Amino acid sequence: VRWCAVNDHEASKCANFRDSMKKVLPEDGPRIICVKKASYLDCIKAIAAHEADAVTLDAGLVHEAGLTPNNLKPVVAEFYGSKENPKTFYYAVALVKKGSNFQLNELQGKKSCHTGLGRSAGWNIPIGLLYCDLPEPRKPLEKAVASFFSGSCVPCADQLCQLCPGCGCSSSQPYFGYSGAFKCLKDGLGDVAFVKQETIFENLPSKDERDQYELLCLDNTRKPVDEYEQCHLARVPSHAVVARSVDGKEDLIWELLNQAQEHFGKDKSGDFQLFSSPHGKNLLFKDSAYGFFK
Numbered sequence: 001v002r003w004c005a006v007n008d009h010e011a012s013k014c015a016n017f018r019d020s021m022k023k024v025l026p027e028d029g030p031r032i033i034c035v036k037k038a039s040y041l042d043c044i045k046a047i048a049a050h051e052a053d054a055v056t057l058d059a060g061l062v063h064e065a066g067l068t069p070n071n072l073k074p075v076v077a078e079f080y081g082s083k084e085n086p087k088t089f090y091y092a093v094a095l096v097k098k099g100s101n102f103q104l105n106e107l108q109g110k111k112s113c114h115t116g117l118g119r120s121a122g123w124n125i126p127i128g129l130l131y132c133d134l135p136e137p138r139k140p141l142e143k144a145v146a147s148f149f150s151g152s153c154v155p156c157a158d159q160l161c162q163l164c165p166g167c168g169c170s171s172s173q174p175y176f177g178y179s180g181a182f183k184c185l186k187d188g189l190g191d192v193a194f195v196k197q198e199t200i201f202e203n204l205p206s207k208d209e210r211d212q213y214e215l216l217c218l219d220n221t222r223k224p225v226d227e228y229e230q231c232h233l234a235r236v237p238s239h240a241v242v243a244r245s246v247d248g249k250e251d252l253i254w255e256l257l258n259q260a261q262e263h264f265g266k267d268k269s270g271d272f273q274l275f276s277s278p279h280g281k282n283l284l285f286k287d288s289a290y291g292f293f294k
């Protein structure tokens with residue numbers, strides 16, 4: 001199994017993932033090969049091209065990855081709540097800054113932050129919520145959305161890279177993932193950051209600073225970031241790892257993943273550690289993950 005690492009920081013974690021498993025997995029056990037590819041769909045073409053074997057995509061990404069004449073399929077899925085009460089999904093939430101007296105109503109001429117183009121909480125869900133209203137010339141969605149906010153950081157797009165000129169993927173700073181959309185909000189975003197619900201607590205273990213932001217709700221109202229089950233834009237399926245439909249290394253892939261979660265799972269400090277890393281935030285898997293269901 002040749003895991004596809006999306007650029008430098010991920011490449012580094014993969015490197016870590018590689019050698020530890022080499023210390024645990026039988027005198028063989030998959031024993032990975034870190035393939036690096038600047039972007040995710042880059043990793044998609046790589047897998048299909050038989051250049052790679054796997055990657056963990058957002059579920060909006062798992063979707064477009066099923067596109068064409070034979071594209072990939074989900075094989076392993078992460079499950080976010082506990083070990084006690086797993087859970088195969090999360091919530092999209094619109095995170096904003098306390099006191100910007102604007103509601104989901106008036107996103108109007110505001111600047112916003114996203115995770116990336118075509119992801120669940122970062123784009124699919126908020127735009128779904130938002131068009132109709134979006135400028136008629138709704139030709140391109142990207143273009144009515146350009147036309148509708150007035151500053152945005154939508155990584156991996158191409159325009160709306162006004163807050164992260166170039167719209168890159170992970171070596172992008174005040175932009176890119178969850179992590180980075182939220183960083184976009186901490187300065188720069190007309191207090192709109194479309195994330196996941198577990199994002200503020202990842203970044204902020206301080207209640208006081210966390211009392212500095214709120215959520216935007218359908219029920220046209222702002223609320224404390226602690227009660228997101230009551231203010232959350234929508235529910236979303238969950239990140240899965242895709243492997244080719246035919247001839248992928250499915251059972252191998254799950255062989256890897258399932259033994260690498262026993263060592264290196266949620267509760268353990270095996271130098272390695274699956275669901276967190278020093279090279280930054282959500283590399284190879286999401287930090288919020290707890291494990292893997294098949």
Ligand SMILES: [Fe+3]
Binds near residue numbers: 059119120
């Ligand atoms: Fe996601």
